[PDB]
Structures are given as C-alpha cells and as structure tokens.
Design an enzyme around this catalytic site. Structure first.
Site, PDB file in Angstrom:
ATOM      1  N   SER B  95      -8.008-103.219  97.432  1.00 16.29           N
ATOM      2  CA  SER B  95      -8.494-102.468  98.589  1.00 16.29           C
ATOM      3  C   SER B  95      -8.171-103.105  99.936  1.00 16.29           C
ATOM      4  O   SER B  95      -8.408-102.503 100.986  1.00 16.29           O
ATOM      5  CB  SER B  95     -10.008-102.241  98.479  1.00 16.29           C
ATOM      6  OG  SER B  95     -10.730-103.439  98.719  1.00 16.29           O
ATOM      7  N   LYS B 138     -18.922-100.821 102.080  1.00 10.08           N
ATOM      8  CA  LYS B 138     -17.963-101.301 103.060  1.00 10.08           C
ATOM      9  C   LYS B 138     -18.243-100.710 104.447  1.00 10.08           C
ATOM     10  O   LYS B 138     -18.223-101.424 105.445  1.00 10.08           O
ATOM     11  CB  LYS B 138     -16.544-100.985 102.570  1.00 10.08           C
ATOM     12  CG  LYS B 138     -16.198-101.752 101.275  1.00 10.08           C
ATOM     13  CD  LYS B 138     -14.824-101.411 100.690  1.00 10.08           C
ATOM     14  CE  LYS B 138     -14.573-102.211  99.413  1.00 10.08           C
ATOM     15  NZ  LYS B 138     -13.282-101.849  98.741  1.00 10.08           N
TER      16      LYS B 138
END
EC number: 3.4.21.-
Lengths: 187, 185
Positions: B95, B138
């Site tokens: 990611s 996140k």
C-alpha cells in the site's frame, strides 16, 4: 451445493453507484488452436489481458515448484483460444478484484484440475503470487453468505477491514500458494 | 513548504487499530557505483517501486503530465536512498507503493512535492492506482496527524465509513494524482 468443476469459479462484485454486493459466476474454457486469441463475455479486455499474463507466469511457477501438478495438455496460453465469461460485468473501478478468480479459472482449465464450488473469492494477484487488496470486502462477504457459500476467500491485507461477522468461514490468504490447497481438488 | 522526495504514507499494524503516518524520504545521486540504500522499507517493495518509477517517470513526461527533465533521468546510473519513519507489515507493505514511486519521481526529476496530504495505494505499470487495506484506519491517521486531505484508491471509496474533518480524494490513476501533489508553479 455441487461437486468440483473445471474452469468454473465464483467471484464477488460490488455493483452500481450504491455498491451492492453480489456473487458472479465465472467460466473459463481453453482450446488448442491455430487461430489463438480471446473471446470475452462480460469482462473487459484489460482485466482479461492482465489475468492471462498473470496466469501464464503463475501457472508455470507453481507447477515448476510442484505446488500444482503437471498439466496433461500444453501449459502455454499463447497457442490457444481462451473463452472467459462473467454472468455479469464488474464495475470499472472494482474490476481488478476479479483477477485472482480469473487466474484460478484459467489455471483450472489449463491444468484440467477441478475447482471446488463451496467458496467464493475476491482479490487480485501480482506476478510474484502475492494476493493483492481489494475494496468492498464486507459487501462481498455478505453476498457470499447470501448465496449460501460455506467459505469466502479474501486478501490477508483486507482482514483489518472485515466487520466481525459469522454465518460463513472467512479465510484470509496472502499468496496464490495458500489459495491452491483451498480451492483445488487434488484428489 | 514543498519538499523534493518527501511524502507521507499511511500504515496499519497488528490485527487492527488506527494507522500511523509514515514519512518517506527519497534522495537520488549520480554515481559510478549505482545501487540502493534502504531504511525501514523491504527490498521487495523498494525494487518494485524503483521499476515502477523508472517506467512511470518516463511515461508521465512523454505524455506531457510532467515537464521535460533538465537533468539525467536514468535510475540505473545512480544510488537511491529510501527511508521510512517506520517499517510496514509484510501484508500492508504494498500500500506504500504509490507514495514511494511519487517520492522517487520527485527526487529524480527534482520537482518538489506538496506537503499537505497523506496517501495510500499501490500502482501497476499502467499507472492505475490499486486498492489497499485498512483505508478507514489510514484516513483516521491522516486526520489526526493534521492533514487537510488524504488520497486513496477509488476502488476503496466504498469502504470509507463516513468521516469529517478531512478531504478524502479518491483517485484511479497516477495522472489524476500528479497535479494534486506536485508543486509545478
């Protein structure tokens, strides 16, 4: 609630602006041919091409590593006509999440190994065999449960996203290597 | 404000919990002994990112998405330094690819990156922004760190649990990202 089938697998998609989860039946057929090419039904050229490039590499890799049996037929994909059909198209933005399923279906048809039908799967793959993250894992898990699948396979990267739920076996996988023993009938 | 080769990624550790903002710094220098020097970034992610950056940097410039570089743009003839404030987990590592790639392109082309956003997402050679895991955790990290906006993969918009206090910007390609993060002025 059937027995294993070759080249048939169930993916999970989120459809429409509302992102509605639903199961999608995927069928892949492969035949040797002097006029190689692909015939796609409800699957974009991009998703298809990428899935083929991946299946080409990964099929050779797992077989060479003895994680999958040697195919009876020629394992090369460039010398045949590949037929891929989806019961329904994935949305453009969610489409890549069908790659793992398409690869497994290609591998299944290529090596003529029956694929179990008691699971649905969502996730992508990279040339190394890593299972890649996807979006809408909860909507997809619920759709699998709705159709009565005993198991649903998702990327380990998405476990954090899973809203604790029961009624189905949620199985996180990080590699195609971990998937194989779960979806293939090696008996 | 803008800095060359500096960007903020977003990582999630353990089974769960809000993420951590991860400062990523890339420096690139010409050298007769080209190679990489890694700090808190795995060799796999670093290698993949460099390959992606080499291809996408050329693609963006050739497609008029970034200006023609005034310097040498070859990565094979230089030493690349990549450091993360903290390591990512093996399963969440991918990611950070978009961020690393952007930071490499930034250092390679000497174009400063805005410092008002945090990003998460991977990339393929075609420039598509790929889905990631733990987007909610996140986005939270970004907000708490004070970021005005956070960039995420469009494929993950559906996962986003309604939140306030921060601009959530979904993107499908690197092209969409470039004008939003580089300081071309």
């Amino acid at each position: 609630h059937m027995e294993p089938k070759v080249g048939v697998i169930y993916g999970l998609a989120v459809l429409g602006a509302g992102g509605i989860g639903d199961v999608t039946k995927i069928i892949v057929q492969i035949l040797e041919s002097k006029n190689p090419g692909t015939h796609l039904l409800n699957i974009s050229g991009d998703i298809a091409k990428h899935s083929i490039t991946l299946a080409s590499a990964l099929s050779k890799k797992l077989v060479a590593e003895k994680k999958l049996p040697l195919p009876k037929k020629d394992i090369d994909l460039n010398n045949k006509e590949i037929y891929i059909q989806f019961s329904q198209s994935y949305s453009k933005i969610d489409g890549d999440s069908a790659t793992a399923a398409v690869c497994l279906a290609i591998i299944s048809a290529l090596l003529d190994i029956p694929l179990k039908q008691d699971f649905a799967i969502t996730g992508s793959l990279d040339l190394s065999g890593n299972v890649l993250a996807i979006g809408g894992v909860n909507e997809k898990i619920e759709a699998a449960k709705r159709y009565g699948f005993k198991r649903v396979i998702i990327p380990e990267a998405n476990m954090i996203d899973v809203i604790e739920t029961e009624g189905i076996e949620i199985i996180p996988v990080k590699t195609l290597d971990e998937i194989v023993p779960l979806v293939f009938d090696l008996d």
